[PDB]
Amino acid sequence: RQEILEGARRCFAEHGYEGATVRRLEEATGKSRGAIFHHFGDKENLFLALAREDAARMAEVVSENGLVEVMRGMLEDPERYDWMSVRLEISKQLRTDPVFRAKWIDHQSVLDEAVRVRLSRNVDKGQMRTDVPIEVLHTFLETVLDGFISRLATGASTEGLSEVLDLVEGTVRK
Amino acid sequence: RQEILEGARRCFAEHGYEGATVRRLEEATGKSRGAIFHHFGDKENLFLALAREDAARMAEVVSENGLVEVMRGMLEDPERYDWMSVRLEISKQLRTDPVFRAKWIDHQSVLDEAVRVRLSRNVDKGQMRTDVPIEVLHTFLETVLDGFISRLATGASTEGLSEVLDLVEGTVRK
Ligand SMILES: [Mg+2]
Ligand SMILES: [Mg+2]
Known about the structure:
Chains A, B: One of its GO terms (molecular function) is magnesium ion binding. The first copy, chain A, has 174 residues and is mostly helical. Chain A is built from 11 helices and no strands. Chain A starts with a helix and ends with a helix. The interface between A and B is large, with 42 and 42 residues.
């Protein structure tokens, strides 16, 4: 299972979401079409399980330092850009396919909750600005994150990005 | 040609980039496979010409009010989300395919120049903060824009976004 997810993350990154064929998946994992669908059912579910893994990892990071720290980590990891692209191929599906949408959102919930807890702790400590509702701050942070993912996925340089993150953090602080 | 571009923008929005078949394109335009490839050569070029149109329109907006105004316009236009998605399907191609990359960047140059001119005028007027290099401000704005495109393309609500834009503008001002 862990073997399947690692290999599949590699396969999706290297070949894309449609290009991630049963053939390619067996090739990346060394397991069969049968033992892959056995755990997960279909491609979409294997995808969501990988998304949920990312979400749980990011959630731990957010707990320590925030969404800005997740973004800092992305600057340190250029090898993961290919996987980030995979993630962006699905957007119309995410927006219009209601069952898929709900599943995507549910698989992200650990992260969404970690971000809410973190911001709550910041507010409780008096560290965020209070002239802007916390929910606007939250949407701003999530927007910057999506921006980072997109730019990095599409081949932008890291340049000035660590300074952009300093600006982003400064923007939400008291 | 104008007939072809309008109809093709509709076809790409409704069916996606791969799903935008010759068959579908003729259907959206009322023109032939031959008269479509005649002007533009292939799908990719018809795509780039549409990207260049978007860039020229955005450039005019930026000239008047900035990138924040482009983003405000996106909140007023939910009908264009489908086209925005099309735009995100290509990301690995944009990042790794060097000829395609260069063509994409060239087709965006009118916008890139409009943003640089606008920021230059802001600086000349003393309206931007000067503790953060202008090029960091520029990357921050472009990051927010990519964020907007992504979030809106993937079915986020507009909620709090107009306030996020107020925050974004306030962040770069003196
Ligand atoms: Mg922080
Ligand atoms: Mg402005």
